[PDB]
Amino acid sequence: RPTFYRQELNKTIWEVPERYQNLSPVGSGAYGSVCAAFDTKTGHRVAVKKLSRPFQSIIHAKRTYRELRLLKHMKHENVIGLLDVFTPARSLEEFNDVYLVTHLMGADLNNIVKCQKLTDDHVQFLIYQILRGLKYIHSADIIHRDLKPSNLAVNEDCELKILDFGLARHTDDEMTGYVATRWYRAPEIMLNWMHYNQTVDIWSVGCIMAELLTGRTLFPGTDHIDQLKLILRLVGTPGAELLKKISSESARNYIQSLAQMPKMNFANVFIGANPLAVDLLEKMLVLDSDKRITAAQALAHAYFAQYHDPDDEPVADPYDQSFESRDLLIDEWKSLTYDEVISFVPPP
Ligand SMILES: Cn1ncc(NC(=O)c2ccccc2)c1C(N)=O
Ligand SMILES: [Cl-]
Ligand SMILES: [Cl-]
Ligand SMILES: [Cl-]
Ligand SMILES: [Cl-]
Ligand SMILES: [Cl-]
Ligand SMILES: [Cl-]
Ligand SMILES: [Cl-]
Ligand SMILES: [Mg+2]
């Protein structure tokens, strides 16, 4: 066990191993508080997150376990990984606080799409890296659920990491009105007409790619229904084949109240874009989720010929999510979390 030291920063007590020095508060959310620090063991600048009320309810205890399991599994160049996890507690009986350590990230994709002139080469490389990370994530049967520019870290060499996995957290209030929190969501989950599945992440990538090409949000709806109307004007209303597949009766009743619309010509929407970029967008932004391109298929698209290497696009180890269907007490989720904290083995 390392030696820990205590300090109060912004009315919050931080008790951390001596290896972490020069702690500086950087932000706070409902999830917890975050400090930047220097890690003397690895030489990395790191982000240290202290979880807020991690075991206050069954829902919150299960969410803490879910986050730690996901972060411990992810080992890929284009996905956030876990450098360390620790607790100052010396036994399960005094266990109360959880701290998570990752590489410190600077700019997100917002900080570049608004502020840079991107060449087509930049778009190729950025979307390539998102799809490389997504192939890995999806190969473990994980769904990200919240891909958007603020959840993509980028550095000065245009290298990208996927962050901030959806932990089943977002509220109804946070999705209401003219809000970027909803602009990247697939139409079939915006009003919960389908269960989440991996194809919803590919919709998000299409929305992001379009915005990198044009500098503008693709579907900036003022509310759920305005946004659906923007989507259907671009990709058309459902055809007979998709209508037959749609399982939600609420979806069918409302959708068939709208006048039918054909799919638009994407070459007249994304004026001046690389024809190969337009072709890939047509394959991602498909209304019928069953027919969207997959991440593995998209990596082999000719738009990425300059970067695609099928020997350097790895898949993930299997990921056991059977805990999601389990009903446990608060203290049982807490004990499972404690076991995962003390069993952590750092990367080389
Ligand atoms: C079997 N199946 N394949 C696709 C799909 N639905 C859709 O892709 C969809 C898209 C927009 C709005 C609502 C539904 C279904 C289904 N269970 O509804
Ligand atoms: Cl230490
Ligand atoms: Cl990382
Ligand atoms: Cl503790
Ligand atoms: Cl965003
Ligand atoms: Cl479904
Ligand atoms: Cl009509
Ligand atoms: Cl597993
Ligand atoms: Mg985020």
From Swiss-Prot:
Q: Which residues carry this modification: Phosphotyrosine?
A: Y178, Y319
Identify one Gene Ontology CC term for this UniProt entry: cytosol
Outcome after substituting Y178F: Phosphorylation blocked
**Highest rank taxon of the organism:** Eukaryota
State the encoding gene.
Mapk14
* Description of activity control: Activated by cell stresses such as DNA damage, heat shock, osmotic shock, anisomycin and sodium arsenite, as well as pro-inflammatory stimuli such as bacterial lipopolysaccharide (LPS) and interleukin-1. Activation occurs through dual phosphorylation of Thr-176 and Tyr-178 by either of two dual specificity kinases, MAP2K3/MKK3 or MAP2K6/MKK6, and potentially also MAP2K4/MKK4, as well as by TAB1-mediated autophosphorylation.
List this protein's GO terms for biological process: angiogenesis; apoptotic process; bone development; cartilage condensation; cell morphogenesis; cell surface receptor protein serine/threonine kinase signaling pathway; cellular response to ionizing radiation; cellular response to lipopolysaccharide
Query: Which coenzyme or cofactor does it need?
Result: Mg(2+)
User: Which EC numbers does the record give?
Assistant: 2.7.11.24
Can you name the source organism?
A: Mus musculus (Mouse)
Q: Where does ATP bind?
A: V26, G27, S28, G29, A30, Y31, G32, S33, V34, K49
Q: What class of enzyme is it?
A: transferase
This chain's function reads: Serine/threonine kinase which acts as an essential component of the MAP kinase signal transduction pathway. MAPK14 is one of the four p38 MAPKs which play an important role in the cascades of cellular responses evoked by extracellular stimuli such as pro-inflammatory cytokines or physical stress leading to direct activation of transcription factors. Accordingly, p38 MAPKs phosphorylate a broad range of proteins and it has been estimated that they may have approximately 200 to 300 substrates each.
> What are the residue boundaries of the Protein kinase domain, all occurrences included?
20-304
Q: How is it modified after translation?
A: Dually phosphorylated on Thr-176 and Tyr-178 by the MAP2Ks MAP2K3/MKK3, MAP2K4/MKK4 and MAP2K6/MKK6 in response to inflammatory cytokines, environmental stress or growth factors, which activates the enzyme. Dual phosphorylation can also be mediated by TAB1-mediated autophosphorylation. TCR engagement in T-cells also leads to Tyr-319 phosphorylation by ZAP70. Dephosphorylated and inactivated by DUPS1, DUSP10 and DUSP16. PPM1D also mediates dephosphorylation and inactivation of MAPK14.
Which protein is depicted?
Mitogen-activated protein kinase 14
Motif, TXY: chain positions = 176-178
